[PDB]
Design a protein around this ligand. Structure first.
Ligand code: FAD
Ligand code: FAD
Lengths: 44, 474, 474
């Protein structure tokens, strides 16, 4: 549900994916996916 | 003839594509029959390709180990080491014989019906299978699946007698090791086979029109390092070079006539065996397609749509005879998928995630895009590399050839291509394959716990290099 | 000269994970210092463990092939196959020396400061290294990171002299193949080392308190099958037995008293060499932990939290001085993510995905949970298996020993454990681990396209069988 890196890097940024959405193969929340959650924080 | 047979799925050809589609069709509850023209099943993979040449490189490999410096340098010391080629060859065949028995056995288990004979579509729902004693068998069927596979692309002007001038399949049964030997073509097939007889004591020279070794879609960097490694072992190559013709002579020796692919440094190599390895083409001879109005690709292939349907909807085609890579796993895949399709399921296949492997030693395996394809495409990428000289497992076995090259997209760090030159590349490339079907990033794969010490760990270290900029051990 | 230095992180030990954290830390831009007491770097893994033992398992395997029926059945005939232990031992020292050389060199390019000596933590911000000859070296440091590794667990009333009663260390440097060998403990290290000498001519029996060979977490059914195989090779086992003591005889031999663990059907076994390996324990002596108020836990490991910190926040312990598998790949990862956490980031590691591997032949490897871990957890599963006997590359290679067994959660097809007995297992489990980290389900693996012909196909076939009722080739 979370690629290793996706998960690792959510954690480092004290947030989860309940917000942002999934993409990529087996509906696994991508690191691409997380980065976008990441950039939406700053942007915000 | 006698009494017409009744079928849901009639599969023509019994190679890798055909025999799994038949069994899968079976596993799904289809009155399946599979026709194969030859005595044994397994098509070309099993009987004159993959399995033999593999069983042979395996053996030829251990030999060079035992005859060379490897063994003496690790404590194991032999008086003399002779080669018993007939015993070696027998090993290969026992394996093939055993496997081919299996397939037949797999058929009974699933209630697949094996009809022997040279099948041919004689209706939109019928194929006639004719044995050479003139016997015949008609199957009245709901769908027809074609898997007639491929054949050697023959070289015009040079006639293969299968004795001193041979193709893949004659080079697998050489009755003796040739002194000198030339190979027209440095593709996976040629290179592999050449390597076998090289390892055995043959002086082997390959001649290729193109500027690189290994097939198409190989990375030019790993191709060149690859070639270089073979050159060290004793293999000699004559790249960017075409043959004018080759001539048999008084004392047996063959004289091939080479010349620059462009200019003209006309030369003449003289060998004892001439392997012709210039390609392989689809095989549709006498299937009866001309008469059903099915046109071929300009390269001899069958135009099938997305669900593997030909111009005639109930007639499909899959494997070597249809577009895509001419690989065994590739056919098995279309085989299964095509059937699950008849079954009413979805037919997706991702041709980007289909591993390619050359089994010399060292192995070469890759999946996804190469650097050249990524440029031609306009994709911004980065590369991380980890050599086996730095891999522990590798150093510990004194086998330190090659590197693992990973291509990750510069921005999303998505792995776009993995290429392994080195020990255990064939089995490594599947882990890659997996990661790639996941849209892995070089980061993801780096955070996976790979066990120590393994060849694999260098696959991990190359992504670690591509996503952070450098690895720990290199 | 002997004069203070300072650093951001000072790491004690240069085993896996000790030196990898050192390097990692350096590359994130900590001024780091690695202290090591031994004359070489690498820890036990590289000097007396993993590497050296892999060098012999691999060398002695090529013996068992050249000095038996294998080579002969491949058509590699040889006059005499004589062993030269000096030289086989001489290639192992080679590997190790070259490898430890490498670490010294990595430490130079990542600018890691190397301090030789026994390190004591003299204070929350100070480590004191004492050289061979009293010569001292003080380090004032922001963080100190403990990676002092493990040592041999000694056996009640038996003393390792490393000459005739040896531990793993001694074992890797025997001076001739011992005629009869006894091994106390059938864990990993055990079967591993026993198998090396059993292949080289020795007569080994392995006595073990528990009812199964292979360590903890190994799966019952594959343990039984692993045992069965090693038996046919000549490896003799004594399960549910306990060694009550050993006595060293007059002429040179050693007498072990053994006995049923359960009751006590006593009996003696003479032998020329005893290999004592019942376990390893966290090594942590002269570290000054006491005068610091870090208590150890009852098994003697340093209790650390989620970021690997002890009761003292700037003092971290990782590797096998703390809980979790005592494995080299587990040390390395804690080393990596420990420092990454000191540098601000996220520190999560999922110990359910760290593989295990026994490098005998056949190989044994697993990752995730075993039938009995699942069964005592109240978790419903389903099972999928594929014998290498039905695998194309193993059959072609005259290597068909074993099977792959995957466990999937009943209803959610989600892969829970993967277990491999057979050729290439060690590398294959890495694919496994990648699949687990992705929370992949059986079907996900079955869809992935594995190159043909390869061992990995076994791994695909077993998942397919766990997901859909049955596979294709079996
Ligand atoms: C030397 C060599 C090495 C190779 N190594 C590899 C490798 O390592 N990895 C890999 O993936 N691939 C390898 N290949 C290629 C691989 O064999 C092909 O991808 C695979 O054989 C194609 O399988 P298939 O089912 O498409 O066809 P085929 O194996 O070609 O089978 C077609 C079958 O149909 C039969 N047939 C044809 N027409 C009729 C008819 N009209 N009626 C009845 N029967 C018919 C043929 O007799 C044959 O049995 C190698 C090939 C060669 C020769
Ligand atoms: C025979 C054998 C075979 C093995 N095979 C495998 C295998 O195949 N796969 C696998 O994963 N694992 C294997 N292991 C286990 C593996 O070695 C351990 O998991 C690994 O060595 C632990 O690494 P480490 O960094 O925790 O500690 P260690 O390697 O034990 O390193 C600790 C280091 O610290 C030094 N040290 C200790 N105290 C101090 C101090 N106070 N000051 C300075 N230096 C100090 C020691 O000298 C040593 O260098 C094997 C072990 C043995 C012996």
């Amino acid at each position: 549900r979370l690629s290793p890196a996706a998960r690792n890097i959510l954690e480092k940024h004290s947030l989860d994916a309940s917000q942002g959405t999934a993409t990529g193969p087996r509906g696994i929340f991508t690191k691409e996916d997380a980065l976008k959650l990441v950039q939406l924080k700053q942007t915000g | 003839a006698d009494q017409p047979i009744d079928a849901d799925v009639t599969v023509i050809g019994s190679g890798p594509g055909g025999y799994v589609a038949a069994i899968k069709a079976a596993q799904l509850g289809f009155k399946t029959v599979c026709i194969e023209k030859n005595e044994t099943l397994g098509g070309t993979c099993l009987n004159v390709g993959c399995i033999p040449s593999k069983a042979l490189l395996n053996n030829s490999h251990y030999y060079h180990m035992a005859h060379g410096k490897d063994f003496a340098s690790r404590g194991i010391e032999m008086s003399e080491v002779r080669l018993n080629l007939d015993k070696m060859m027998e090993q290969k065949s026992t394996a093939v014989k055993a496997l081919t028995g299996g397939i037949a056995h797999l058929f009974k288990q699933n209630k697949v019906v094996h009809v022997n004979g040279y099948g041919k579509i004689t209706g939109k729902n019928q194929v006639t299978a004719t044995k050479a004693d003139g016997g015949t068998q008609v199957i009245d069927t709901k769908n027809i699946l074609i898997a007639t596979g491929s054949e050697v692309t023959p070289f015009p002007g040079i006639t293969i007698d299968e004795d001193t001038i041979v193709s893949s399949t004659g080079a697998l049964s050489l009755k003796k090791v040739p002194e000198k030997m030339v190979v027209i073509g440095a593709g996976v097939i040629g290179v592999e086979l050449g390597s076998v007889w090289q390892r055995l004591g043959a002086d082997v020279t390959a001649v290729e029109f193109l500027g690189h070794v290994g097939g198409v879609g190989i990375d030019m960097e790993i191709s060149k390092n690859f070639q270089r490694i073979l050159q060290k072992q004793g293999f000699k190559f004559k790249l960017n070079t075409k043959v004018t013709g080759a001539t048999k002579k008084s004392d047996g020796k063959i004289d091939v006539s080479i010349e620059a692919a462009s200019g003209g440094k006309a030369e003449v190599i003289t060998c004892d065996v001439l392997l012709v390895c210039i390609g392989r083409r689809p095989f549709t001879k006498n299937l009866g397609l001309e008469e059903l109005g099915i046109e071929l690709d300009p390269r001899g292939r069958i135009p099938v749509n997305t669900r593997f349907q030909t111009k005639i909807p109930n007639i499909y085609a899959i494997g070597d005879v249809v577009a895509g890579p001419m690989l065994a796993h590739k056919a098995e895949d279309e085989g299964i998928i095509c059937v699950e399709g008849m079954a009413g399921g979805a037919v997706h296949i991702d041709y980007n995630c289909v591993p390619s492997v050359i089994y010399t030693h060292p192995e070469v395996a890759w999946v996804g895009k190469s650097e050249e394809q990524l440029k031609e495409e306009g994709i911004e990428y980065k590369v991380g590399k980890f050599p086996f000289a730095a891999n522990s497992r590798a150093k510990t076995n004194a086998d330190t050839d090659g590197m693992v090259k990973i291509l990750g997209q510069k921005s999303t760090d998505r792995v776009l291509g993995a290429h392994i030159l080195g020990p255990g590349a064939g089995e490594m490339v599947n882990e890659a394959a997996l990661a790639l079907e996941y849209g892995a990033s070089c980061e993801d794969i780096a955070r996976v716990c790979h066990a120590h010490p393994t060849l694999s760990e260098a696959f991990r270290e190359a992504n670690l290099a591509a996503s952070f900029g450098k690895s720990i051990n290199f």
